[PDB]
Structure 1
Amino acid sequence: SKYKLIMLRHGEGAWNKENRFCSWVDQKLNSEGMEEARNCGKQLKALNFEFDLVFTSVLNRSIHTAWLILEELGQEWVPVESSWRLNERHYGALIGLNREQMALNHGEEQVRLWRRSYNVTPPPIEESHPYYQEIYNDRRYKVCDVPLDQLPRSESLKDVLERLLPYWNERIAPEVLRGKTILISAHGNSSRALLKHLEGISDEDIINITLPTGVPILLELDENLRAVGPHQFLGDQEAIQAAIKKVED
């Protein structure tokens, strides 16, 4: 491959262990998520990765993950750019609800579509939603590349791809072609969406792919910034399977 890139997702939190979606709620990493990020930095250091640029979302968990990684590398000086376009999927009205609640308010089949499918968009968060203000009153969203009301109120996996792709094409991709070594610190759905594009994964097959947290994902890209073969998980094979098991089902 002409070019190589690293992407990863931060360790997940308390809500995830109670099968709740954090989505755009700006939850901090727990100590576990902190060790996970440090563990990546160490692994990447062991591989002598030398980054020239980092891209993160605007959610602090992804920014902290990047910072802990650069510290483990002694690369704190490497520029970091952050974008709402790398944000986790917006789960809309479903934000904050556990499995049982979603199922009761919407129906088990609806909810499975909303988590599982590629193109079906959850119902939008409304202003009555207990996390509407906590998201849209945040100064972060007043200085994006689109006005604050142009920002989504919910998203399918497809919708993720569609707002991420322009950031990839306009901001990240040119850096890759310039020969820079890029780290992307992102989230479950943003990472999945990006891979879908880079590997030309089908709408059908993207649903089933799993992405372990706190594992460097290596992409080797060709002239056209397409993956040469599948993505590769970097590090010890037994920590990788543990991590894959954690994101199963």
Structure 2
Amino acid sequence: GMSKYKLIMLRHGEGAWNKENRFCSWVDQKLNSEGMEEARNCGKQLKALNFEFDLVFTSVLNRSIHTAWLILEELGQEWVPVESSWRLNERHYGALIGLNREQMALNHGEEQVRLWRRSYNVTPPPIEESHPYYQEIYNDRRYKVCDVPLDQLPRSESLKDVLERLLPYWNERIAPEVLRGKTILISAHGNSSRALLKHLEGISDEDIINITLPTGVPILLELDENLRAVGPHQFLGDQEAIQAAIKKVED
């Protein structure tokens, strides 16, 4: 249980939809100017702390990939290998994708909606072919060359479901590289970062809902010989800026 490995994880800056209380989810929206600035800020902060990455993991959503590219550019580490997987994707919010709070409550019921947003293990209704964002997701050829067939990919996910499709990628692909002594960057999303932290820190089903995950802030994990967190995750950089980022993700 002694600190042996260091891992950096971060989440991209959130977009217009997030201000309108809409879930982007698997919709492949680009960074906005604020998102691009947050990625550059992360890169400059990681450079100030002399981080030297050996491997980067991202989702297949371009906002996670652009975040990594901008960080590697700020570090002068563009040669560092990048691997992308649907298993680091944001939570699939199913039928709720693109709806604000009001619209969700009207369509599905006020009770069901609380669970879907705030619970650990309640799965939202699956996205159906009638959904305006269904074709844009499932006709995208990035989902024809995943480690599971197109028709085996989820149509909706609880936070528990996110952890269950992320853990195999951690165990099989990322964890071995950490054990080799490589310094890893994970460019992830709100739910994918929360799911991995739940696993590495042994956070309860009850407590995971409440933890604060600011965007555009490097999250340092110190891991022991079992790849278990030694202490809680640590936010790197200026405490003023971090407190600001924490306020922005407040619910």
Match of 1:27 in 2: 29
- Structure 1 residues 216-236: Cα deviation after superposition (integer angstroms, max 9, x where no partner): 000000000000000000000
C-alpha distance in structure 1 between counterparts of 2:111 and 2:243, whole Å? 30
C-alpha distance in structure 2 between counterparts of 1:53 and 1:78, whole Å? 6
1:34 match: secondary structure: helix
C-alpha distance in structure 1 between counterparts of 2:110 and 2:192, whole Å? 25
Of residues 221, 226, 231, the one that matches 2:233 is 231
> How far did 1:112 drift?
1.1
1:68 match: secondary structure: helix
User: What value does the CA root-mean-square deviation take over the aligned residues?
Assistant: 0.4
> How far did 1:86 drift?
0.1
C-alpha distance in structure 2 between counterparts of 1:115 and 1:106, whole Å? 13
Q: Structure 1: which 5+ residue stretches go unaligned? A: none
> How far did 1:108 drift?
1.9
TM-score by length of 1: 1.00
C-alpha distance in structure 1 between counterparts of 2:168 and 2:76, whole Å? 31
C-alpha distance in structure 1 between counterparts of 2:109 and 2:190, whole Å? 24
Moved more, 173-182 or 106-115: 106-115
TM-score by length of 2: 0.99
- Structure 1 residues 62-90: Cα deviation after superposition (integer angstroms, max 9, x where no partner): 00000000000000000000000000000
1:207 match: secondary structure: helix
- Structure 1 residues 85-141: Cα deviation after superposition (integer angstroms, max 9, x where no partner): 000000000001111100100122211110100000000000111110000000000
Match of 2:146 in 1: 144
> How far did 1:187 drift?
0.0
Moved more, 102-111 or 156-165: 102-111
C-alpha distance in structure 2 between counterparts of 1:53 and 1:21, whole Å? 29
C-alpha distance in structure 2 between counterparts of 1:111 and 1:69, whole Å? 36
- Structure 1 residues 136-174: Cα deviation after superposition (integer angstroms, max 9, x where no partner): 000000000000000000000000000000000000000
1:102 match: secondary structure: helix
2:206 match: secondary structure: helix
C-alpha distance in structure 2 between counterparts of 1:11 and 1:157, whole Å? 20
Match of 1:89 in 2: 91
C-alpha distance in structure 1 between counterparts of 2:179 and 2:99, whole Å? 42
C-alpha distance in structure 2 between counterparts of 1:239 and 1:200, whole Å? 28
- Structure 1 residues 190-232: Cα deviation after superposition (integer angstroms, max 9, x where no partner): 0000000000000110011110000000000000000000000
2:24 match: secondary structure: coil
Structure 1 segments of 4+ aligned residues over 2 angstroms from their partners: none
C-alpha distance in structure 2 between counterparts of 1:52 and 1:222, whole Å? 19
1:6 match: secondary structure: strand
2:56 match: secondary structure: strand
Does residue 37 in structure 1 map to residue 59 in structure 2? no
C-alpha distance in structure 2 between counterparts of 1:223 and 1:38, whole Å? 32
1:204 match: secondary structure: coil
Q: Structure 2: which 5+ residue stretches go unaligned? A: none
C-alpha distance in structure 2 between counterparts of 1:247 and 1:35, whole Å? 17
C-alpha distance in structure 2 between counterparts of 1:61 and 1:67, whole Å? 10
C-alpha distance in structure 2 between counterparts of 1:99 and 1:55, whole Å? 32
Match of 1:179 in 2: 181
Aligned length: 249
C-alpha distance in structure 1 between counterparts of 2:110 and 2:40, whole Å? 38
